[model samples]
Target: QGDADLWSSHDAMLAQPLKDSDVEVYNIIKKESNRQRVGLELIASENFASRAVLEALGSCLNNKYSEGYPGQRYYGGTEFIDELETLCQKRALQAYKLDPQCWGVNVQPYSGSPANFAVYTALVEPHGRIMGLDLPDGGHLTHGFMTDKKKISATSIFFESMPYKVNPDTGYINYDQLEENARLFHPKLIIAGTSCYSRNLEYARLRKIADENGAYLMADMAHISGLVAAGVVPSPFEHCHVVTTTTHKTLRGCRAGMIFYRKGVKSVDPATGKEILYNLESLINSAVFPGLQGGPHNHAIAGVAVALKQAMTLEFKVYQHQVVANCRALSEALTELGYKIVTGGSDNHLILVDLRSKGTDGGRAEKVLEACSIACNKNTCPGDRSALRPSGLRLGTPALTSRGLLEKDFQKVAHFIHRGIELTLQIQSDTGVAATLKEFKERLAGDKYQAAVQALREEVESFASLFPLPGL
Candidate 1:
């Protein structure tokens, strides 16, 4: 009976009944965990939050219902909630080295999409005109895109949508073209942001474009928040009236959102007819609460609090800079391997690889890479007619960098991607074979394709295993 005494009373539950969601859930959870642990995570919009962030996200703080702003909560016993929220806001500003009085932040919205909606709800009327970078070029869905012949935002349905595009040849935002559109459309708000773009936005030029047409600029830095905060990228604060970002992605926190806006505009308060100042601070606060949402997720707010503190450290800056560096390495490595790199190269976290000229597409590359355990997403590139199966594969290094992968490591990542695409084409003709999802997946897992994928998978796992994930 050696070691029999190690069985504690908690072990008595082994004989008890439980739902499959508990037991089978454990199996599925481990499977997913192993999947992530074994793969090369290259998704541009995904990242790993630290253990501290995860602990706060899953803590008892999740049970609380703090319905209003910190000090002005409508509920009782919010002393601690107020303290945590205050810390969260303070750390957020500190993360960006922001001057306290000039900018204000709200960390309550559930995620980026809703946060953007709240931004729109705050300033623009439903039918007002607004403009953004076109989706096929690099813009986000929240940027008033038109899709399937319907308004991307209910078709911008409540308001009309005007869009600007990147140079079809250079893959760069065409500011001159954008200016021409602004002069013609007279948009009420100008948005500066993108989802798959790989270049730095020229904020000063964009601000000028907005001003010449009398439009307010709203910069959505959801993907580049961490870089902008690190001062590695151009700051939007000097040019934009309002800003929004996802708390995750390169910021590497829990999945949540943040809004930062200009402070104190001189105005008259209607409630008491007193002379007062109203800025985006008050406007955003009310729009996020009564206008767009209700109770805040206190758990996620705590997670954001810890992440903001993390972001203030020197380590965060080093990591943020390295993300950009690795992206450049990957893009160069891919381009050298005979792949077309959009915009020549990346100056940010993502790279857009146009696979059309290679007799493949984003969907094909994405699948082969996944089979090789090198992950990425199918994306629309310049002049792509089919979004369903676009011409580009969008990849990023934030997750890879978060795992401590460096520029040299990303060169290998690029080679793995190159190998996958080269092999994927060997299996089929340019016109594409008759394929079903089930058959396609099966085909990749088989010898003709899977044999090659398996070889790359081995290298990927070996490479990835050396860099253990944070908060695993």
Candidate 2:
């Protein structure tokens, strides 16, 4: 895997032979393991899990088939299975200070998207009006998508999603406008979360708005769940009607999903004016099993349990603090390098770098950064030019901070980004300002930046190696 040329030379042989035999399986695993061991992952949604969590995921739990919740299982040998699930639930409840009766904790959903869908399935009737942050404005596909017409058509009576844009000048949500929408729309559900917005959510205010408008407040804390648990950021539990999150990301666990709800949250159905007191946990269990999904991944639930346990430690709190601090440092460094950052700066674990000022597109930036081994994803800033070639890069400090990287490492990363942007701009200019936009592309293919980027790659390796992943 280290010899790129060797792999490339036999690419055809490798592609064909691998598809035909067991040897290909080993080879693919070996290659993937090499990539995991060598690459520096900066994606906000990715993280390195603890040894205990990994152990639980790879343990005997994989062989178990506890189809339903705890005691009320559909399979035999459920005694220990019930213990594991209950342990996980207890940890989740303890971490979030959840109300036992009203708050339901479900660890069965495969991931965030499904977990969100489960919430929708349980809470609202078909064709009920739902509101979410606009996709291009930093919301998730599961929130609502014009392209997923089938899913939308099956559910949601009138799905009218309006954008809650950041202030063009400040790059922060226009709270007043958001409140106006809540009041005017009176949606059944008001979804709050983002894939690229770079600031703390005002959950308290959103909860108040939801209360006044009789809307269900669903907070997708997938991005900041760990920080929220560690007390580094405000918890959405107090105000949100339901909270859903991925067990990974800042949670630093196996790839799974967790859904949480406040205890004793009962409300009458608006459509029927029927008095209803929701038993959140039971509702979630029913939704996950019969309504939306099938059997739960036992291994993932065990891993989630371990992660939740680990999160209760002092070290985890310190880690959460470092994650936020590193984000602030990185934002400042990039801003000092003259890159435009969304929200002016970040108060959480992520930053959205607007590349408009540099006259570079996110697609080009993504390619150049990949070449340099510094990883991140393309994102659209508020009022961006195009979605395909967006105007920004979404970056976060969770992975780097988890690797124990601090300000110095952030500064180095920012410098490489600055150089990478400069190189990309020069390459675009040198291909000739006029010619066939095609000729410019052809001329710019395989430039000296490859070598420069490789050198930067080595620097990144050296930096990442200093703070080896836990249990590595």
What tens-digit string does per-residue lDDT give for candidate 1 at 1-472?
A: 3455546433655545443337887778678778878889999998988999999987778777888898888888878888998899899988887777878999998999888888887877688888998877888878887766777675287667788999888889999999998999998888999999998898899999988888889999999999998988888888888889999998999999999887765457788788665467877899898778877888999999998888989999999999999999998888887888899888899999999768777876788888788889999888888776788999999998999999999998887787888876765442248564345556666676767877888988888888877884
Indicate the worst ten consecutive residues by lDDT in candidate 1: 12-21
Candidate 1 lDDT (Cα, whole model)?
Answer: 0.85
TM-scores of all candidate predictions against the true structure: 0.90, 0.87
**TM-score of the candidate numbered 2?**
0.87
lDDT of each residue in 321-358, candidate 2, tens digit only: 98988888889998888889988888788888888888
Which parts of model 2 are misplaced by more than 4 Å?
1-23, 147-163, 265-276, 431-444
Candidate that would win on lDDT: 1
TM-score: which candidate is best?
1
Q: Provide the lDDT at 70 for model 1.
A: 86
